[PDB]
Structure 1
């Protein structure tokens, strides 16, 4: 039916029309495919930004720094987004990308344990530096879109080196959409502490039949853009490829 030339052209056009530069990497079984309008982004390093929340949550839970029902209280200080001015569980903080919660979690884990855990799972360049509460936001920790799709593939298949229950607890936190029997699990990212800014959407689709298809979208955000472009491009791409 549809030629891969036409798939490549369609997905490129989604990035072109959002007036950005980006890539989406899709993995099917063992085969990695790179689509978009700036393919060379695929092996370039960027800050993980809020995508690190997934591994922050795995580490915190595995090491009993939190539980999935624990309510992280708002301290009452003004926050960047009014939606973050409330009490929340890790799960809620995951959907809202509430960095103050993931910062508190990182502080509980602590620098020594954080570094050792980031090494053990071999995440990105694995370097967190000396600042426990912003290493995923402004450097030194970096990761390529290929490395992110591989992380999502690992987590989707319970292959990371954490208890199965830890991985299931985090995965539950990541359900963002259901489309005709398919379930989309993903974590968004928007790094505003770097120039240029980076947008991420990394997760997988779980199809009706049980197959999991991981993906990582990576693009350049500029002041002005709506964050929902990350989602809109992702769904359009997955739909174009008949994955959903």
Structure 2
């Protein structure tokens, strides 16, 4: 019996309180609902940043560039984060958002195959340009929050043009939370090498009954913000709406 006015006000306040500008798009069946404090972001293009790991992994697994058990060794060079200075599978690297592992995977795939596959899947503007190892971080690849939630809807329902097994393997890599019988599958993103910086959390809720509710959160990140604000705003929004 809560009014849509009150839901909208609540979710807007979550973005207002974090002192940023963002949107969260929720999909139920075929209907998109846009919430937040900057609704106009819904159809604007931003770099996907680490959300691209989802598709990079699909492409690599489908094209036999890696397996799910393969350990990508740390080369022993210093990394931005100490947590990345270790050997990891694709799944472990998904959870740690270990860019160097996904860069190696992109390089194995190669520019020609990567462009063909990104085009085939129709992801965002589909332009990867000439640099196979950073196109999702600094451009030219861009995508809208609407496109991101539709991608998540496709993956959640095994509708992407990949083998069922490929989709299931990558979805297993994306489980980030269980809340009162609901599972949240998602990938975060933070485009640090663009200005303004973009933050993402794109995924879906799998409810106890098997129903899947895709979402994409998209906001402006500032130097000094905590990455966990993406998760906190998302969980509060999903809870406010009764999705979890």
Q: How many residues align?
A: 244
Q: Deviations over 1:29-57 (max 9, x none)?
A: 00000000000000000000000000000
Q: Deviations over 1:87-106 (max 9, x none)?
A: 00000000000000000000
Q: Distance in 2 between matches of 1:107 and 1:139?
A: 17
The unaligned stretches of length 5 or more in structure 2 are none
Q: Distance in 2 between matches of 1:70 and 1:134?
A: 22
Q: Distance in 2 between matches of 1:126 and 1:13?
A: 34
C-alpha displacement of 1:207: 0.1
Counterpart secondary structure, 2:136: coil
TM-score (norm 2): 1.00
Q: Distance in 2 between matches of 1:221 and 1:212?
A: 28
Counterpart secondary structure, 2:194: coil
Q: Distance in 1 between matches of 2:170 and 2:243?
A: 23
Q: Distance in 2 between matches of 1:122 and 1:234?
A: 26
Q: Deviations over 1:20-77 (max 9, x none)?
A: 0000000000000000000000000000000000000000000000000000000000
**RMSD of aligned alpha carbons:** 0.2
TM-score (norm 1): 1.00
C-alpha displacement of 1:164: 0.1
C-alpha displacement of 1:226: 0.3
Q: Distance in 1 between matches of 2:96 and 2:190?
A: 12
Q: Distance in 2 between matches of 1:18 and 1:69?
A: 39
Counterpart secondary structure, 2:161: coil
Counterpart secondary structure, 1:136: helix
Q: Deviations over 1:106-157 (max 9, x none)?
A: 0000000000000000000000000000000000000000000000000000
Q: Distance in 2 between matches of 1:84 and 1:19?
A: 30
Q: Deviations over 1:144-199 (max 9, x none)?
A: 00000000000000000000000000000000000000000000000101001000
Q: Distance in 2 between matches of 1:81 and 1:6?
A: 41
Counterpart secondary structure, 2:151: helix
C-alpha displacement of 1:202: 0.1
Q: Distance in 2 between matches of 1:75 and 1:190?
A: 24
Q: Distance in 1 between matches of 2:197 and 2:92?
A: 24
C-alpha displacement of 1:7: 0.2
1:45 aligns with 2:56: no
Q: Distance in 2 between matches of 1:5 and 1:82?
A: 45
Q: Distance in 2 between matches of 1:135 and 1:157?
A: 27
The unaligned stretches of length 5 or more in structure 1 are none
Q: Distance in 1 between matches of 2:234 and 2:203?
A: 10
Q: Distance in 2 between matches of 1:229 and 1:5?
A: 23
* Equivalence for 1:71: 71
C-alpha displacement of 1:228: 0.1
Q: Distance in 2 between matches of 1:229 and 1:83?
A: 20
